[PDB]
């Protein structure tokens, strides 16, 4: 049963791996055309390679750094200074 | 086992058309895979193969009838049809149906020349041009 | 079936079966005699006779099909043949008027995406590979040395991607339209550039080119964190290329040329 479960996880990971543009990524991650319902389902079902895939990771980074275009490219020291000045 | 009968014999000239029909009865099991064919019997000449068709649908014709004659099969109806394009006076003969039960896709023996050696053949119909 | 990726007639089924398994006489007979045969009929997976023949390395069937003017999926057939390394089939497809009588092979991915001719589409929606992948990029990806040389003779080159922080209008428009597609296209172009086949056949000094490319790819791995593994793999590819070139040296003169960059600075 674990082998079959890993087979299903490998299937969804492969499907996400074959995405080429943002529309396909959104369809896979959200389930329709940024709820991230499939990402949340993968987290609940512990499909780690699905959410750890770079195709899902880049979209997660886009939501993570929303309204901060430019702050993403800064180094760790700049972000630490940002945390310090926020404190 | 396989009983073949022929029909549709007529008399046309000057670039006419004619359909010859072959009805298969008796055993007829797995008829769709049979190698069907038509061969001629001229009044003064020997038996000459005309057309053949295998189970896959590949059709072969003799050079004397290539381009004009066409052969088709209705697997559901267990029937073999020979459509005749523009006729010639040489196309006047006893046309016999022929069937080979044991054939296969792209069979080397499913040829117009081998049609005369098929295990089963019909009584023949007269075509006069 | 949930998805219909393609009812075929008996004649179309026979034609597709003949093309798939290389039944050359049957394919020729249907092309020469059948006036009611659609040469562009597709199988259950949406592959026509040309795609099936190319996928099964049926060069004679491909040559027969290429004589049909209305034959479709010529560009996809070339891409499939390049990906499978079928050199003779690539030659035959490159002789098609869609390539010989046009500058298709000399089109950049941006330029080939500028016009929506759907030349490389393998079906009614999309292409077999990523749209930014050109025949030369695909040949570099698959390490097809003969195909890479053939496309280089025809003028095909892999355009160097701009800097990650480039502020040109094209880069900004690509980032604002689809940042993920922009990143994937950059990765594909660099994968073509980092290919030892393209490196050895396109650069007058492949060792220096691969060294600089390895450094650039390592920097991009530091910058583009999400696709870090891909950039590190490409950087290791460049390093493996220069190591192999040095490994093939036989006398001191070749070693000095590799280590010094010309004919004891040890610049390399």
């Amino acid at each position: 049963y674990r082998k079959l479960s890993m087979q299903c996880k490998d299937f969804v990971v492969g499907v996400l791996d074959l995405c080429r543009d943002s529309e396909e990524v959104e369809a896979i991650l959200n389930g329709d055309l940024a709820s991230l319902s499939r990402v949340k389902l993968a987290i609940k079902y512990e499909v780690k390679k699905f959410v750890a895939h770079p195709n899902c990771q880049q979209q997660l980074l886009t939501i993570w750094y929303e309204n901060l275009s430019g702050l993403r490219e800064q180094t760790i020291a700049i972000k630490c200074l940002v945390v310090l000045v926020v404190a | 086992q396989v009983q073949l009968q022929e029909s549709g014999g007529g008399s046309v000239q000057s670039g006419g058309s004619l359909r010859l029909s072959c009805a298969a009865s008796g055993y007829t099991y797995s008829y769709s895979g049979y190698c069907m064919g038509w061969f001629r019997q001229a009044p003064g000449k020997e038996r000459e193969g005309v057309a053949t068709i295998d189970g896959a649908g590949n059709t072969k014709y003799a050079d004397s009838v290539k381009g004009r004659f066409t052969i088709s099969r209705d697997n559901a109806k267990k029937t073999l049809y020979l459509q005749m394009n523009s006729l010639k006076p040489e196309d006047t003969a006893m046309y016999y149906c022929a069937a080979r039960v044991y054939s296969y896709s792209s069979d080397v023996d499913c040829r117009p020349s081998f049609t005369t050696r098929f295990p089963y053949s019909g009584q023949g119909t007269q075509v006069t041009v | 079936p949930a998805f219909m990726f393609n009812s075929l007639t008996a004649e179309e089924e026979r034609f597709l079966d003949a093309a798939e398994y290389g039944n050359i006489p049957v394919v020729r007979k249907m092309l020469e005699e059948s006036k009611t045969l659609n040469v562009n009929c597709v199988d259950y997976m949406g592959q026509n006779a040309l795609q099936l023949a190319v996928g099964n390395e049926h060069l004679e069937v491909t040559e027969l099909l290429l004589k049909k003017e209305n034959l479709a999926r010529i560009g996809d057939a070339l891409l499939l043949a390049i990906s499978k390394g079928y050199v003779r089939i690539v030659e035959a497809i490159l002789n098609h008027p869609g390539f010989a009588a046009s500058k298709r092979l000399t089109l950049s991915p941006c330029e080939q995406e500028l016009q929506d001719d759907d030349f490389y589409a393998y079906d009614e929606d999309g292409t077999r590979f990523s749209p930014d992948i050109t025949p030369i990029i695909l040949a570099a990806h698959c390490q097809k040395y003969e195909v890479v040389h053939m496309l280089l003779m025809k003028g095909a080159r892999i355009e160097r991607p701009h800097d990650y922080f480039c502020k040109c209008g094209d880069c900004m428009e690509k980032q604002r339209h689809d940042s993920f597609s922009h990143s994937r296209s950059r990765i594909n172009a660099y994968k073509g550039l980092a290919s030892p086949a393209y490196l050895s056949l396109s650069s007058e000094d492949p060792v220096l080119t691969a060294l600089e490319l390895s450094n650039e790819l390592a920097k991009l791995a530091n910058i583009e964190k999400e696709f870090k593994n891909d950039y590190r793999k490409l950087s290791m590819q460049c390093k493996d290329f220069v190591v192999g070139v040095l490994d093939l040296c036989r006398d001191s003169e070749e070693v000095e040329a590799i280590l010094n960059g010309d004919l004891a600075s040890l610049s390399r």
């Binding site: - | 000459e48 080397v108 | 290389g22 050359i24 390490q143 492949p206 192999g244 040329a257």
Partner: protein, 71 residues
């Protein structure tokens, strides 16, 4: 025309290309290559069988033409 460095680099790159092809031929055989040879045999079978059929058809034409002269 070409410098000594250019000639040495050309020789080394040609050696690399041949070596890379040799090592590519040393890679393990996958199902795709074997399927390609299977398709080669299938296509060869179709070509040879039709060639034999055409030859026998010409022989039958000889049979019928000879029989008319004999009779």
């Amino acid at each position: 025309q070409p410098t000594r460095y250019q000639q040495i680099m050309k020789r080394l790159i040609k050696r690399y290309v041949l070596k890379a092809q040799v090592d590519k031929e040393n890679d393990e055989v996958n199902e795709g290559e074997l399927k390609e040879i299977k398709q080669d045999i299938s296509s060869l079978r179709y070509e040879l069988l039709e060639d034999k059929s055409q030859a026998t058809e010409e022989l039958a034409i000889l049979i019928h033409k000879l029989s008319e002269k004999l009779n």
